[PDB]
Amino acid sequence: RQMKRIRAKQEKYRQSQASRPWLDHATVIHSGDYFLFESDSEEFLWVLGQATVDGLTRWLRAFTKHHRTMSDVLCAERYLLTQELLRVGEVRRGVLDQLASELLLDRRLHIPELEEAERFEAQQGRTLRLLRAGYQCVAAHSELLCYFIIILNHMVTASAASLVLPVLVFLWAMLTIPRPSKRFWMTAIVFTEVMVVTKYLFTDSYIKYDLVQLMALFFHRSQLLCYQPLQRFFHDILHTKYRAATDVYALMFLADIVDIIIIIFGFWQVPQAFLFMLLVQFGTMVIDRALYLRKTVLGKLAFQVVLVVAIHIWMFFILPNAVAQLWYFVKCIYFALSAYQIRCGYPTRILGNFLTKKYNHLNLFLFQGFRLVPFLVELRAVMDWVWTDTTLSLSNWMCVEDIYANIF
Amino acid sequence: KVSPPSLGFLAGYGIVGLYVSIVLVVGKFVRGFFSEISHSIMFEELPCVDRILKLCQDIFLVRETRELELEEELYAKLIFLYRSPETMIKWTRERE
Amino acid sequence: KVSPPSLGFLAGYGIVGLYVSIVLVVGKFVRGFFSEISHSIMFEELPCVDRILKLCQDIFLVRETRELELEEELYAKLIFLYRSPETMIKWTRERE
Amino acid sequence: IIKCSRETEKKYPQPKGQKKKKIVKYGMGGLIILFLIAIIWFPLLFMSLIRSVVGVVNQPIDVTVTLKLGGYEPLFTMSAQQPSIVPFTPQAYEEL
């Protein structure tokens, strides 16, 4: 509709111009006149603590809601089945109607005992519902903490043992069809078994976290309860487009800014070694702009598979540390979000600006914050001009990118 | 008593120069925008900027449909809006 | 092992100040002309500047014939050309 | 400057709406991005490399040792020089 209206106006102004040949990019720019601007119709503390943590567990209710509905409908059908299960069980759809096929609806019977259990837990909304909803949270997400512990045993001094897990954690699990794999969990759990079995040349903190890694893996395994000639297949499956197609650029670059703050925080040997990482970090922070701006997905995948093993090879030669592994952990967020970006895959027709979506006072404060840091607004306006399809010069572009940023 | 090193980098007469350099450069910086906002009035005191903002979102918009001859028939309207402030007052009114 | 002198001029805490001073002053210098070319559009985007250039060569010219009352009857035309941008658009058109 | 940038158009006219200078974009832009990264970066190189150079060893040529019992006289004294100093062989470094 917008492109329709714009072209319909420009044909109008090309009509009454003569009342077109040999226009050559410097006689179409310098042709503006007053007739372009006609008005054409314009078409004591305990209440604070209890209330704030009840709001926080309300936020956690909002996080848990869909697994909560799944659990509620399955426990309703469960208790109907068990109170049925006195003599026999022989039919599945025939017990689906003693109270329609593929929905998420709830228009059925109601056992008052289950309501009484809900009333009883409604008696104790002080701390019980809070940590109960926390357990329901980690049972609802139930997959992210597998990745969390897989990174978290690697951050505590695990040199080459738990390096082989996070590489294929990213590469397999976060790049595939949304139900991470058939068997990645199996080749996870057998390696995490034999990794602690082979720690028997006879460790202290590593096994102390690997037992948690095992039980988290089996926790997700039970909670899931459903189950060189092949790289090219699923790599093509990355380009079959069944995806939901959302994005996030705003958190990748934010995490990389936090990354560079961590590197600068590391200045109070390895300070001499920080700076090659700093420059190649800048190179990544440059090139991902172009990856986002040509709207290409294959280059981001190639950049992913290069960058993860490059930074993991750098996770050897730092040691000839705590801020360095913190830095490693904070860019694992960047790799995870990058893999999310690979999976959903760049919704079209969104260029915009990262902070200008609704004219709130918060937005205005954050925008004037963003234009305060040195070398950032003009770096954005230069790397935007290089890779986007435009027909102006460089200095003819920055007039637009300043008129806009003042009018906003 | 001993003296830890304090004048070991300016030979005595090299801080009054440094301090007066600091105060001169930050003074004639800070008089940049607390006593010069007269010239940039006519680009900063518009009543209702919406007819600029629609056009500038259109120049942002066409850049992704790649109908690239439609930039330099809008960009002319923008530059000519900034070259004749009379027709900024003809274009930044209020509505009814 | 020995150390050749490296911190002998800032006492440790005197480079982070110096480096952040360098980057602040060159940043708020380099944002001088990469994100401020909006105000100086109407003196920098003329289509065809020839009717200014003939007049300015005449102000250069009369200055050597020493017919010196002919400067301040041309210089008025120049300053009045720069004081009313409406009549820069009436004077910097193209030809036919 | 405006007249020269107008006449350098006339010898090289560009087609309307297109001809978007694909190599020339990288040409004018890469110098800018690497220059600004260098302005950030190269001050943080010569910040580091004056505190890095170390390794000129100071093997002490002089040992003087005395046993002084009482304030009356140092009873035993001696000094020694590099005949009575053993620079290590790396075999003896592995021994230690």
Distances (CA, A) of A296 to A173, A285, C29, C93, D84: 21, 16, 35, 44, 73
Distances (CA, A) of D80 to C22, C58, D66: 53, 92, 12
Question: What are D64's strand-pairing partners?
Answer: D79
Assigned token pair, B13:
């007469």
At residue D76, the 3 state secondary structure works out as strand
Identify the closest residue of chain D to C12 by CA–CA distance.
Answer: D51
Give chain B's contact residues with A (Cβ, < 8 Å). 43-44, 49, 52-53, 56, 58-84, 87, 90-91, 95
Alpha helices per DSSP H over chain D: 2-10, 22-41, 90-95
Give the amino acid at D36.
L
Question: What are D79's strand-pairing partners?
Answer: D64
Residue A275 is inside which H or E element, if any? helix A270-293
**Rounded Cα gap, residues A133 and A54, in angstroms:** 11
Nearest 5°: phi and psi at D78? Answer: -165, 160
**Rounded Cα gap, residues A397 and B75, in angstroms:** 10
The alpha carbon of residue D55 is apart from the nearest alpha carbon of chain B, in Å, by 26
Q: Which residues of A touch B88 (CB under 8 A)?
A: none
Closest CA to C37 of D93, B79, A143: B79
Distances (CA, A) of B90 to A10, A161, A405, A407, B48: 20, 71, 22, 17, 12
Q: Which residues of A touch B62 (CB under 8 A)?
A: 3, 6
Give the amino acid at A229.
P
Other Cβ atoms within 10 Å of A165 Cβ, number = 19
Assigned token pair, A223:
């909670």
| DSSP count for chain A of H helices, then E strands | 17, 0
Residue D67 is inside which H or E element, if any? strand D63-67
Give me Rg for the CA atoms of chain A: 28
Q: Which residues of A touch B43 (CB under 8 A)?
A: 406
Identify the closest residue of chain D to B73 by CA–CA distance.
Answer: D17
Question: What are A394's strand-pairing partners?
Answer: none
Task: Report angle CA D74, D77, D78 to the nearest 5 degrees.
Answer: 165
**Rounded Cα gap, residues A371 and A31, in angstroms:** 33
**Rounded Cα gap, residues A11 and A377, in angstroms:** 35
**Rounded Cα gap, residues C45 and D6, in angstroms:** 10
- The experimental method is cryo-EM
**Mind spelling out the 3-state secondary structure of B13-81?**
CCCHHHHHHHHHHHHHHHCCCCCCCCCCCCCCCCCCCHHHHHHHHHHHHHHHHCCHHHCCCCHHHHHHH
**Rounded Cα gap, residues A195 and D44, in angstroms:** 42
Q: Which residues of C touch A401 (CB under 8 A)?
A: 35
Dihedral sign for Cα A140, A146, A152, A153, please.
positive
Nearest 5°: phi and psi at D76? Answer: -100, 140
Assigned token pair, A282:
């800048």
**Rounded Cα gap, residues A360 and A358, in angstroms:** 6
CA A196 to chain centre: 32
Q: Are strands D76-80 and D63-67 parallel, antiparallel or unpaired?
A: antiparallel
Angle between helices A298-314 and A322-344 (to 10 degrees): 160
**Rounded Cα gap, residues C15 and D53, in angstroms:** 18
Q: What is the dihedral of CA A364, A367, A369, A374, to 10 degrees?
A: -150
**Rounded Cα gap, residues B81 and B79, in angstroms:** 5
Contact A366, A360 (CB under 8 A): no
Contact D40, C23 (CB under 8 A): yes
The full length of chain C comes to 96
For testing contact with chain B, the best of D9, D16, D20 (most B CBs within 10 A): D16
Contacts 24+ apart (CB under 8 A), A268-273: A269/A320, A270/A318, A270/A320, A270/A321, A270/A324, A271/D48, A272/D48, A272/D52, A273/A318
Resolution in A: 4.0
Per-residue exposure over A240-261, b if at least 16 CB sit within 10 Å of its own CB, e if not? eeeeeeeeebeebbebbeebee
Nearest 5°: phi and psi at D79? Answer: -130, 170
DSSP A99: -
The alpha carbon of residue C6 is apart from the nearest alpha carbon of chain B, in Å, by 12
Residues 6+ away with beta carbon under 8 Å from C96: none
